Design a protein. Structure first.
Lengths: 129, 129, 129
């Protein structure tokens, strides 16, 4: 899977790493992938450059808000549900990020849609299952 | 929905906000979502960092070019058609952006693929419809 | 199609252009699209801001690592397979980028999901095939 993080400027890089590690953990556990299936990016924005509201749900948002986009092979509705709780669990406990400050949007693709190196389609050749 | 904007450096932040507001309006009207279903990001690029041509269609592109990526729950083909015209309508009238300078690519996901806060899947729990 | 590049700071802009051109070539040839169906973005990251491992496959990664996200109308599994080899072929031969340093994730949408200019849905109106 590919986790793309959009966050506001303010964190030190150590804070960024903690965030990335916590989220990695939650992903590995929710989706039962190897600990080294780790593909992550971070873009930092100034206050101009993100607007994130709450669709009337009564969160909660501070400048620590983390927006996460996930590109993923298919997963059961159970796995996703698990992922979100595991994710906010880890971010609160390991990073002190309120669960009010975590937004996730997820996009699915297929086995043919990944090549991890060497122009190889590893899900198709069977180098990965 | 999630609107990700890629644009070239040049705008003041007030110009950025106008753009974001205009596009928000066009989205709310085309898709009939609440005015506070607002999730938006902006990345600014130098001339190196985007190449956007026109597939031989005879637009029109200036450095004001706006590329928009939309992540969305499913929408009818009618709603999308409406969205694009509403979008360029609003950007021309509210921002003075030529409709030649607006590119949109859209990606669909499902109810299970969103969590707006608290590790909750609101479309699944029924906190949102 | 839309090619979004995530790369680490280090390249000159000329190096960036070569990369973008090589990848454009590989895409045009693999997918049989017109040479002017060219839509590309680049984000540069500091060492903090990307973590890209190898899922135990034994690549190979340097700071020249290129992560590519592709948004695309549907393509045959053959076309994609072709694309990845063509892509690493071109990057090694034209840019000197080890095929160990190239990661691709691809996302599909439909004809209704594109508007290249003027709030027009060109695949739907038939301005493009």
């Amino acid at each position: 899977a590919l986790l793309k993080f959009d966050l506001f400027y303010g964190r030190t890089d150590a804070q960024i790493k903690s965030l990335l590690d916590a989220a990695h953990g939650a992903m590995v556990d929710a989706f039962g992938v190897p600990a080294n299936d780790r593909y992550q990016t971070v873009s930092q924005h100034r206050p101009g450059e993100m607007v994130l509201e709450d669709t009337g749900l009564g969160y909660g948002r501070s400048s620590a808000v983390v927006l996460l986009t996930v590109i993923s092979r298919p997963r059961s509705e159970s796995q996703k549900v698990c992922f979100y709780k595991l994710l906010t669990g880890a971010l609160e406990r390991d990073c002190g990020i309120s669960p009010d400050d975590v937004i996730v949007a997820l996009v699915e693709n297929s086995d043919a849609d990944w090549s991890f190196g060497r122009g190889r389609a590893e899900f198709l050749t069977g180098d990965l299952v």
